[PDB]
RNA sequence: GCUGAAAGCAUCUAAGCACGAAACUUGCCCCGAGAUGAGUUCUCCCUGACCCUUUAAGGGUCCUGAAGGAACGUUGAAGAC
RNA sequence: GAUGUCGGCUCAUCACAUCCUGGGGCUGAAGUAGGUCCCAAGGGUAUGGCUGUUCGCCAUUUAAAGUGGUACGCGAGCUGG
RNA sequence: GUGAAGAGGGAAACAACCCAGACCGCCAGCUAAGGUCCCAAAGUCAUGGUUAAGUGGGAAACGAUGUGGGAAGGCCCAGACAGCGUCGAGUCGGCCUGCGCGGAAGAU
């Protein structure tokens, strides 16, 4: 027989809710990336999104070690000459705290259309409330 | 402030102090003896 | 080490709360609160490294010294004296606002924090008072900063005990 | 808040001490509040206003229902002004130019006159090259637009020919010369953006 | 700089606290939801039958044609089109 | 089996080893005005005489008339000394 | 020795370095160099240490109470060491060695 392949039509994706409070950024992000990709399922298929939907609460309370809170720098370029911009981790937390988790996870997901599709299943919130009661997310301790 | 690679006690009133990862010489007697490694 | 080892005598009329990692001493001259580094156990008060803390003796010695000051603070309390040197340099206290004339085109109008109190014995002296040794230190530094004592004549705001070193100009 | 008016034109005011003040005359008819936005419903605090009049046949049913909810006659457009904390308004309230009675300076926003496709000389104040001394077909042309292989491209934001004017412009900190509630007029010192007859937004000066 | 141990002292620093520049983040002006993460608010409009099969976000017929749009015309201190 | 060359003109863009403006330590810093070092790249940063000149000298300005990288930036953009 | 005239795996990419020599087919298995948190296959493996510099992941003379280990020493309850006779336990400064720190400015 040919090896099994997951089918995008029939894949079951569960909903989970994770609390980022006090969790180390990168060690949370690897577990998120793993589960968004579906690497935790026996039906894992490289060309199919078999992963789960994950709500992350309290993104503003994510932890980092060392002097990273002040010294970790996020760079981006605007596309305009001289348009190199930067923000420290602490500035990112103050202004756009959900982006810290989102940026970390995006860099750990595959690049290309499927990786972008996998990222859409991550729902990051700054505080302790989400609006997805209807999806009945299960608590997941990462 | 003298900014040098070699910072040293220049008299008995000079003290070596490390502040924020920088070796400095502070002197109670002589302001000319104030140094920062750099 | 030696600082940390020595416990602090807490007098009668002075009351010490300990709740989690918080000290909040009562008493006549005032009231004061702090939270210490998590390497310190405050057992008089007695201070010591907690286990799993390499800085614990360093942290205990500072804790000791701060609480010694806090228990001084709410008894005899702290006083700081400043002197104005220079023609036309006056000071005057008015509520919680010291008014310094210091040879500027504008009057300086420095406001004391919540519980520091000033008196001008003469116009050329300020006498600060409070329970917090850090805050009275900071207020005194801020007042000195308006016109720090200058090296040719010694003019400006000085600490009354300060010995301002003087020099003469370039020889012609 | 500010008000919406119309650029009537420019004139002057002679003072008794022999100063001629150039003025823009702005007709500021009653601005009628058509909607109040609040934090609960809209996520921000603002008034929407209309002014002037539109012919019934040019008022669409969606537009007409919006005006009818407010209980105001249709005006020529809708504009929003953000509210500060103490500012409160009610739907249907008319706001007149007397708003500016004690305002010393205003910012005036309009659509600048349209120059169409403009060259670099006009649009960006580029210098012309030689009219003579051998110049071949290159009198008002832009010159070089980049370097060489490094970087081997033109940078974004390069100043080049293109549409000029016909855009939103604010002129800040114009003196209010006269507020005439009777005639619905605001006189401001100096020029403001746009052609005679164009819409102007007038706000108390932010600076 | 303050307070302050490690290091009985000293020490702006290790814990803790305060100042500090046209640089930085804002504040000012303009663009801006293709922000595909395509958001929000207000208002308006459409309230008919039936047949068929590969029963399905299925296909067609008759009746109906709204709000609004476009087109055309007269045009504009809008504009190469 | 061709990667157009000095200088000018037009238009730039980056670095910072900073010319001006901003902050600061030391001074053989009285003041005024300097010297030197540290921080700082936001913006600003001559016109002429002579010469193909770049440069330089000179005249007269300026807060200042920065130093470099960009095929010693830029001839499918101009010039052609 | 390899490339030339040599594919495969590793060294991000990278003839000439490391592993290794492709007769063809397989949706079997074991290994090499190199690896095992996610991109990305495999240890968020075990035990004992070191480092706080993101050192690791560019680094020289030289500078420094950074911090771990070691071998001697001088002085010390006949009271040292510091600060003010007081004072009441260690203190002092060289050597060797592990890992770090400064020295460290460039152009889309
Ligand atoms: C080619 N390869 C062996 C290495 C490589 O793959 C890289 C890379 N980034 O992938 C390199 O950077 C490399 O090509 C390279 O450029 C190196 C060096 O430049 C280099 C290296 C180590 C050195 C050690 C000491 C000295 C001291 N110098 C010698 C004398 F002149 C004073 C210089 C070094 C040096 O220049 C690493 C290699 C690695 C290369
Ligand atoms: C990390 N990365 C930036 C480079 C890299 O990827 C490699 C690699 N092989 O893939 C390296 O080898 C690298 O990590 C490395 O180790 C380097 C060096 O060791 C290196 C390099 C250049 C040097 C130039 C001069 C000198 C000597 N002078 C006197 C001393 F004070 C400095 C040493 C060098 C050196 O050690 C290249 C980098 C490249 C790195
Ligand atoms: C003909 C070649 C030219 C147009 C000019 C050339 O300049 C010379 O070769 C100077 S010597 C020849 C002068 N002349 C004939 C007597 C012909 C231009 C010169 C400046 C270089 C020195 C050699 C390389 C070059 C390309 C880039 C460049 O700078 C050119 C060639 C590939 C180019 O095609
Ligand atoms: K939208
Ligand atoms: K340049
Ligand atoms: K100076
Ligand atoms: K600058
Ligand atoms: K060339
Ligand atoms: K040329
Ligand atoms: K070309
Ligand atoms: K041409
Ligand atoms: K061979
Ligand atoms: K690093
Ligand atoms: Mg890939
Ligand atoms: Mg500092
Ligand atoms: Mg026009
Ligand atoms: Mg000209
Ligand atoms: Mg010709
Ligand atoms: Mg011509
Ligand atoms: Mg490219
Ligand atoms: Mg002390
Ligand atoms: Mg300015
Ligand atoms: Mg060819
Ligand atoms: Mg610099
Ligand atoms: Mg910048
Ligand atoms: Mg700014
Ligand atoms: Mg000249
Ligand atoms: Mg060139
Ligand atoms: Mg150049
Ligand atoms: Mg030509
Ligand atoms: Mg060219
Ligand atoms: Mg010629
Ligand atoms: Mg050959
Ligand atoms: Mg090979
Ligand atoms: Mg290979
Ligand atoms: Mg390499
Ligand atoms: Mg490398
Ligand atoms: Mg490869
Ligand atoms: Mg195996
Ligand atoms: Mg894996
Ligand atoms: Mg482990
Ligand atoms: Mg490194
Ligand atoms: Mg080093
Ligand atoms: Zn000295």
Describe this structure in words.
Chain C: This is Large ribosomal subunit protein uL6. The structure is cut from a larger assembly and holds chains A (142 residues), B (38 residues), C (172 residues) and D (207 residues). Chain A has one domain (1-142). Chain A has helices at 25-37, 68-71, 89-95, 98-108, 113-119, and strands at 15-19, 53-57, 73-77, 84-88, 122-124, 138-139. Chain A is built from 5 helices and 6 strands, in the order βαβαββαααββ. By secondary structure, chain A is of the alpha/beta class. In chain A, the strands form 2 sheets. In chain A, strands 5-2-1-6 form a 4-stranded parallel sheet, with helices on one face. A two-stranded antiparallel sheet of chain A has the order 3-4. Chain B has 38 residues and is mostly beta strands. Chain B is 0% helix and 47% strand. Chain B contains no helices and 4 strands. Chain B has strands at 2-4, 14-19, 22-27, 35-37. Chain C has helices spanning 2-5, 56-73, 133-146, and strands at residues 16-18, 23-25, 32-34, 40-42, 47-49, 78-85, 90-94, 97-101, 108-111, 117-119, 125-130, 156-159. Chains in contact: A-D. The A-D interface holds A 79-81 and D 155-157. The complex binds Pentacycline (2 copies), tiamulin, potassium ion (10 copies), magnesium ion (30 copies) and zinc ion (ZN). One magnesium ion binds next to strand 8 of chain D.
Search tags:
part of a larger assembly; 4 chains; B: 38 residues; mainly beta; four-stranded mixed sheet; 4 strands; D: 207 residues; six-stranded antiparallel beta barrel; four-stranded antiparallel sheet; extended; binds Pentacycline; binds tiamulin; binds potassium ion; binds magnesium ion; RNA-binding; ribosome; Antibiotic; Large ribosomal subunit protein uL13
């Amino acid at each position: 027989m040919k090896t099994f392949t997951a089918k995008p039509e029939t894949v079951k994706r569960d909903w989970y809710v994770v609390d980022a409070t006090g969790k180390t950024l990168g060690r949370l992000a690897t577990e998120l990336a793993r589960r968004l990709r579906g690497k935790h399922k026996a039906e894992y298929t490289p060309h199919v999104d078999t992963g789960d939907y994950i709500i992350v609460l309290n993104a503003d309370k994510v932890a980092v070690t060392g002097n990273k809170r002040t010294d970790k720098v996020y760079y981006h370029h605007t596309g305009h000459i001289g348009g190199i911009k930067q923000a420290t981790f602490e500035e990112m937390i103050a202004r756009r705290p959900e982006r810290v988790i989102e940026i970390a996870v995006k860099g750990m997901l595959p690049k290309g259309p499927l990786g972008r599709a996998m990222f859409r299943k991550l729902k990051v919130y700054a505080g302790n409330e989400h609006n997805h009661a209807a999806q009945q997310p299960q608590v997941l301790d990462i | 402030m003298k900014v040098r690679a070699s910072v040293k006690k220049l008299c008995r009133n000079c003290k070596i102090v490390k502040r924020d990862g920088v070796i400095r010489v502070i002197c109670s007697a002589e302001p000319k003896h104030k140094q920062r490694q750099g | 080490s030696r600082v940390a080892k020595a416990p602090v005598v807490v007098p009668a009329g002075v009351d010490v709360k300990i709740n989690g990692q918080v000290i909040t001493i009562k008493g006549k001259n005032g009231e004061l609160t702090r939270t210490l580094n998590d390497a310190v156990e405050v057992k008089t008060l007695t201070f010591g490294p907690r286990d799993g803390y390499a800085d614990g003796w360093a942290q205990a010695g500072t804790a000791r010294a701060l609480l010694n000051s806090m228990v001084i603070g709410v008894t005899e309390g702290f006083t700081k004296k400043l002197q104005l040197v220079g023609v036309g340099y006056r000071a005057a206290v008015k509520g919680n606002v010291i008014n310094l004339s210091l040879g500027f085109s504008h009057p300086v109008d420095h406001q004391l924090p919540a519980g520091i109190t000033a008196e001008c014995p003469t116009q050329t002296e300020i006498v600060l008072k409070g329970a917090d040794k850090q805050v009275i230190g900071q207020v005194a530094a801020d007042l000195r900063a308006y016109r720090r004592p200058e090296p040719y004549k010694g003019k400006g705001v000085r600490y009354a005990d300060e010995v301002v070193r003087t020099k003469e100009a370039k020889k012609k | 808040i500010g008000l919406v008016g119309k650029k009537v034109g420019m004139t002057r005011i002679f003072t008794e001490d022999g100063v001629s003040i150039p003025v823009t005359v702005i007709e500021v008819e009653a601005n009628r509040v058509t909607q109040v936005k609040d934090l609960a419903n809209d996520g921000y605090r603002a008034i929407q206003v209309t002014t002037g009049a539109k012919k019934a046949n040019r008022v669409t049913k969606p537009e007409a229902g919006h005006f009818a909810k407010a209980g105001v006659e249709a005006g020529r457009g809708l504009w929003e002004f953000r509210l500060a904390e103490g500012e409160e308004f009610t739907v249907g309230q008319s706001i007149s130019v007397e708003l500016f009675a004690d305002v010393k300076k205003v910012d005036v926003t309009g659509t600048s006159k349209g120059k169409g496709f403009a060259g670099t000389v006009k649009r960006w104040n580029f210098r012309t090259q030689d009219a003579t001394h051998g110049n071949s077909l290159s009198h008002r042309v832009p010159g070089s637009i980049g370097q060489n292989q490094t970087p081997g491209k033109v940078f974004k934001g390069k100043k080049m020919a293109g549409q000029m004017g016909n855009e939103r412009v604010t002129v800040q900190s114009l003196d209010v010369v006269r507020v005439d509630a009777e005639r619905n007029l605001l006189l401001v010192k100096g020029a403001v953006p746009g052609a005679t007859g164009s819409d102007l937004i007038v706000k108390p000066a932010v600076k």
